[PDB]
Every structure is written in C-alpha cells, then in structure tokens.
Amino acid sequence: EFTYSYLFRMISHEMKQKADQKLEQFDITNEQGHTLGYLYAHQQDGLTQNDIAKALQRTGPTVSNLLRNLERKKLIYRYVDAQDTRRKNIGLTTSGIKLVEAFTSIFDEMEQTLVSQLSEEENEQMKANLTKMLSSLQ
Amino acid sequence: FTYSYLFRMISHEMKQKADQKLEQFDITNEQGHTLGYLYAHQQDGLTQNDIAKALQRTGPTVSNLLRNLERKKLIYRYVDAQDTRRKNIGLTTSGIKLVEAFTSIFDEMEQTLVSQLSEEENEQMKANLTKMLSSLQ
C-alpha cells in the first residue's frame, strides 16, 4: 500500500480516469490526446511515425492505427521535407489544432493541481527523481 | 518533463514488464496486484469492497475479477457472520504458492526503484507521492 508499485499505478490510474471522463466530449481517447499534444508541442521538429512510437512506447501497429484514426478525421496530415523524401513527417491540421487547444486545458488543470502540492524547488527535485526512476525501468 | 508524462510512462514500463512475465501464469496484471494485496494484508481480513477500493475498479468489474480467480481456485470467498453485507476474501494454499511464485517479478522492480533515491530521499518521495495521489482522488 505504501509501495511505489501501488502509488505509481494509482496516480496514473486516477489521472487516466479523469482525462477519459473529460475527453469524452471531444471524441478522442487518452492516447490520441497525448499524440495530438505531442504533435502540437514538439511538431516543428519533423517527427515521423517512428518518433511517436518511441514517445508513446507503443508498438508500431498500435500507433499506426492510432495515427490512421486521427488522419481519418483529418486531424493530422502526412508531409515530407523538401530534400529528405523517404521520411514522412506528421503534422496537425487546422481542425486538430483547434481540438488540442480545447482539451489542452484538461491536462494543464491537472498538471497544476499536481504541482500545487509541492513547494517551488520541491517540484524540481521531484521531477528529477521521476526522470531517474523512469530511467531505471528504461 | 510534465508529471502526467512521467506518471503515465513509469506506470507503462511497469505494466509492460509485468505483463510479459505474468503471461506464463495465466493471470492479468490486475489480478496479480489483487492477489498481492490479499497475500500482503492477509493476517488481517480483506473484504470484496476493500479490493474494489484498492484498484479502484468499477463495482461489477471487481466481482467479475474475483469470480475468475475463484474459478481458478486461487481464492475463497465467504460472507461475514456479523455483517451480512460484506463478504470475505481469502487466499487458498494454491493462491499463496502462486503469489510466492510471481512476487519476484514485482519485487525486483519495486527495488530497482527505491535503489535510485538515497534512503532519505525515498521516504520524502513516498510522502510527496501520497500527497499527490490524495489530490487526484
């Protein structure tokens, strides 16, 4: 009960739960919310289908379907850099951007309720330790 | 670097490593954690509702999970004598041996985590972590 195994699986369960409840209104799933967000935030980088797979820690076929779903809703688009052409870069369409800007608040609200329990430099030290722990599990 | 990322991700690495190694026992990650709680907190008696609160999986679901484990003969269920409304859960010897068999997966993991923070930092961390879990609930 005081185990990190317990702690961690619950702090994320409770988190997944609250996000799904809210995203029901956008017709997107937890994973897709996170995918769109990643595309919104770190998009200009040129990330491909593999890059999202790495970022989501999801099996190629999983993430392949996920992207294929969003593309069906035309919320993302495939684009290719001019000289580098066997790469296929993923980007947000104008509707996807509107969507991200609408739920994004869900996450930010949550993030805040989290960081608001610890002190100013108590959050810096905490994040440093999670990154270290998450690194241990690699 | 966002918490949500980290908490999501950490949990992910954990379910995945668990799921791989538990495949050989014909149980799921959730059932694994349940048997653990029963095994762990067993000198005391654990109720169907305590399991429900523990996961905290939906009402029908927990009864459904339990019925499976009991069909697997890993647990017995019976109805408290004082209070007709809660029912009690108990590990079978089969169940006890099974947990003892798989616990090594979860421990090896739980350990390499405490490993990462110096013993003073660990206590501090379980405290902050509990504080955070309190808010989301």
Which structure tokens are listed for A78? 């495939």
Helix spans in chain A (H): 4-23, 30-42, 49-56, 60-72, 94-103, 105-115, 120-137
Helix spans in B28-58 (H): 29-40, 48-55
Put simply, whether A128 touches B (Cβ < 8 Å) is no
CA distance B1 to A27: 26
Q: Find, among A48, A21, A47, A23, the residue nearest to A99 by Cα.
A: A23
Residue of chain B whose Cα is closest to the Cα of A11:
B133
**Residue numbers of the domain that contains A91:** 1-138
Neighbouring C-beta atoms of residue A112, cutoff 10 Å = 9
Neighbouring C-beta atoms of residue B106, cutoff 10 Å = 20
The Cα diameter of chain A in Å comes to: 55
Measured in whole angstroms, the distance separating CA B16 from the mean position of its chain's CA atoms is: 15
For helices B119-136 and A105-115, angle between their N-to-C axes, nearest 10 degrees:
130
Using a CB-CB distance cutoff of 8 angstroms, which residues of chain A are in contact with residue B51? none
Which of the 8 DSSP states describes residue A95? H
CA distance A63 to A49: 8
- What CATH number has the domain bearing residue A63? 1.10.10.10
Number of domains comprising chain A: 1
SS3 B30: helix
Contact state of B3 with A130 under an 8 Å Cβ cutoff:
yes
* Resolution of the structure, angstroms: 3.5
B75-79 and B87-91 beta bridge pairing = antiparallel
Question: How close is the nearest chain A Cα to the Cα of B20, in Å?
Answer: 14
Which structure tokens are listed for A126? 């905490």
Q: Find, among A53, A42, A54, A50, the residue nearest to A87 by Cα.
A: A50
Which structure tokens are listed for B104? 């090594």
Which structure tokens are listed for A22? 């809210």
Contact state of A134 with B9 under an 8 Å Cβ cutoff:
yes
